[PDB]
Amino acid sequence: FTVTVPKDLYVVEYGSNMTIECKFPVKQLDLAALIVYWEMEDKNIIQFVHGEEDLKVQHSSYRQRARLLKDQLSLGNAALQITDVKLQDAGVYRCMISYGGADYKRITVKVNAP
Amino acid sequence: AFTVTVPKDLYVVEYGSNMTIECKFPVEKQLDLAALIVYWEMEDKNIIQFVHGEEDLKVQHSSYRQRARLLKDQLSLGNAALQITDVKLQDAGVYRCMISYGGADYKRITVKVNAP
Ligand SMILES: COc1cc(-c2cccc(-c3ccc4c(c3)OCCO4)c2Cl)ccc1CNCCNS(C)(=O)=O
Incomplete structure (x- = not known):
């Protein structure tokens, strides 16, 4: 996995x-x-x-403020939705998934101002 | 829960x-x-x-x-025990144990090594 x-x-x-x-x-x-x-x-x-x-x-x-899009799990996609992202939401996120086997990854978020 | x-x-x-x-x-x-x-x-x-x-x-x-062992005789007792032989300073830091057994969870442990 x-x-x-x-x-x-x-x-x-x-x-x-x-x-x-x-x-x-x-x-x-x-x-x-x-x-x-x-x-x-x-x-x-x-x-x-x-x-x-x-x-x-x-x-x-x-x-x-945060939601896992349930209708996308069927497609083998764990999708995290954060609404109204602030500067503080920049950083390194970790999805950890358990489903038979187990694994995790890192996603980095950078937030620009307008 | 777990x-x-x-x-x-x-x-x-x-x-x-x-x-x-x-x-x-x-x-159980x-x-x-x-x-x-x-x-x-x-x-x-x-x-x-x-x-x-x-x-x-x-x-x-x-x-x-x-250098590293997971103690199998401890697993049965619900204990996941990482063994590190001959620790050097390179071993100080934050450790995560992530466990999936029914549920899933993880914890952090901080390891400080005094100097030689
Ligand atoms: C069930 O909640 C979690 C679930 C995982 C999780 C989810 C998916 C996969 C993995 C996992 C496990 C082992 C791994 C791995 C990933 O990747 C590498 C191989 O080994 C892991 Cl840990 C982590 C943290 C949590 C937070 N639990 C808060 C606790 N208290 S409570 C009152 O909520 O019950």
Whole structure:
């Protein structure tokens, strides 16, 4: 099992939305076996465990601002959507995916002002 | 839900001593090696990649060849214990143990080495 980032650097305009993608291999999807986790500066962004997001562990600064696009998991794409990106959202994100095997990658986000 | 725990997230060790750094994880009955992944890392360097019962030495960073062990007799007790023989200063740093056994979780451990 291997997780891939076709793009490991993203340049997003401030105040944009951003969707950063980690690809993992896809038969039909076994939601009960899949765990997708995203993180940045060791803050819990997304904890997608067997079927859905657990928001009791998501960090304050990401409540109602971060989303894993559920309709894209079927395509073997863990896609993290951060709305209204701020300068602080620049940094190094980590998708960790558990789905049979287990792997992780790094994506770097740089945020321009206008 | 599934959580990895770390009784000690700071290890102060002597130059050239041995160190064993632990991440505990829950186990009910018999340990099911096929369901279990344990991975250890420091500074983006692969140390241990114990997946489905067998260590992978192809992926293991050269600086840990012959130097690093995942203690299999501890796994059964829900304890993932990375053993590093003859620690040098190059071993100080932040270690992550990432564990997949049913759920998934990871923890950090900081390793400080006093000098020779
Ligand atoms: C289930 O939540 C996580 C899930 C993973 C996760 C997700 C996907 C893959 C992996 C993983 C595991 C082993 C690996 C690996 C990746 O890549 C390399 C090979 O070894 C891992 Cl760790 C990490 C952190 C978390 C945060 N848990 C907060 C805890 N407390 S609570 C109250 O929420 O329960």
